Amino acid sequence: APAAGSTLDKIAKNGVIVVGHRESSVPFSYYDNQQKVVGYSQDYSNAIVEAVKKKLNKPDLQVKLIPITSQNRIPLLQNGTFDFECGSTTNNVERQKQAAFSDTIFVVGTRLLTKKGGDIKDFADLKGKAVVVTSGTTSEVLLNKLNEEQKMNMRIISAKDHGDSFRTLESGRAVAFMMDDALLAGERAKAKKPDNWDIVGKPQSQEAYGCMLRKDDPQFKKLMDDTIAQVQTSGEAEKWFDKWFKNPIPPKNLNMNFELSDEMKALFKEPNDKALN
Numbered sequence: 001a002p003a004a005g006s007t008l009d010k011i012a013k014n015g016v017i018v019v020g021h022r023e024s025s026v027p028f029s030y031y032d033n034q035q036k037v038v039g040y041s042q043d044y045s046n047a048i049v050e051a052v053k054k055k056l057n058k059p060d061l062q063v064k065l066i067p068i069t070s071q072n073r074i075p076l077l078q079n080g081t082f083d084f085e086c087g088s089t090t091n092n093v094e095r096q097k098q099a100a101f102s103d104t105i106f107v108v109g110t111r112l113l114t115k116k117g118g119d120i121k122d123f124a125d126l127k128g129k130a131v132v133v134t135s136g137t138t139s140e141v142l143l144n145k146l147n148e149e150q151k152m153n154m155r156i157i158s159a160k161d162h163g164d165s166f167r168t169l170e171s172g173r174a175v176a177f178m179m180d181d182a183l184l185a186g187e188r189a190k191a192k193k194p195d196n197w198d199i200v201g202k203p204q205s206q207e208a209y210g211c212m213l214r215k216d217d218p219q220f221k222k223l224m225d226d227t228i229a230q231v232q233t234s235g236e237a238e239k240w241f242d243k244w245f246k247n248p249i250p251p252k253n254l255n256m257n258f259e260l261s262d263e264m265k266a267l268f269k270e271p272n273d274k275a276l277n
């Protein structure tokens with residue numbers, strides 16, 4: 001039975017499960033402009049919600065969706081503003097000190113989005129340039145460290161969410177947008193002129209996405225991991241990948257045209273929660 005102070009206990013006592021979600025993490029957790037929060041990662045959230053309803057024997061359990069940001073996700077998680085979220089949050093050692101993560105659901109490389117006809121081809125070209133990044137992300141940490149350690153004299157602009165960062169680039173307020181490659185492609189898919197943007201540069205890091213939940217809650221993590229494991233090992237995860245990464249997706253019916261890496265296929269065979277950092 002759920003111990004006091006655990007998430008399942010909180011949900012049962014409050015009579016509702018609070019699902020944190022993203023507004024601009026395409027195509028993981030975002031608004032489809034059809035009144036729904038959708039995406040590859042959100043699909044796991046829905047599966048986890050179903051598992052919770054079953055586990056607690058509450059078929060009519062309330063489900064409340066609350067938007068979160070890269071910057072406020074941990075503080076909101078810690079005071080229980082939301083119970084868990086599946087989106088584009090990187091699982092790393094530092095964050096494990098403040099939260100817990102489910103088995104890995106995606107892997108990304110941190111790169112740059114910039115104009116095709118522009119002069120930015122790699123990270124070295126960013127010296128003395130204006131670069132935008134989303135507040136509270138691993139890319140912001142990496143970019144600031146690179147700026148300091150390599151004395152790049154970059155003017156770093158920190159935006160509230162990925163769409164804001166992209167629009168900063170699109171409107172000429174920055175020459176490049178540094179972020180997880182999948183997210184860069186996601187913002188490009190919503191651009192006024194998608195073809196005008198290229199993802200370039202050597203990845204500054206390889207990062208694993210995991211649904212995030214509160215730390216020291218083994219029972220809720222188990223429920224989430226068990227749900228993820230069945231989705232991945234059954235072949236359902238790949239079907240979700242194809243839907244969100246190989247077919248037209250909202251809100252502009254564009255295609256990500258991504259391919260599932262052999263590494264991801266290996267993980268789907270045997271799910272695990274190892275932080276890549």
Ligand SMILES: N[C@@H](CCC(=O)O)C(=O)O
Nearest residue numbers: 070088089090136137138
């Ligand atoms: N995955 C990175 C950037 C993307 C995001 O935060 O939504 C992070 O967790 O910081």
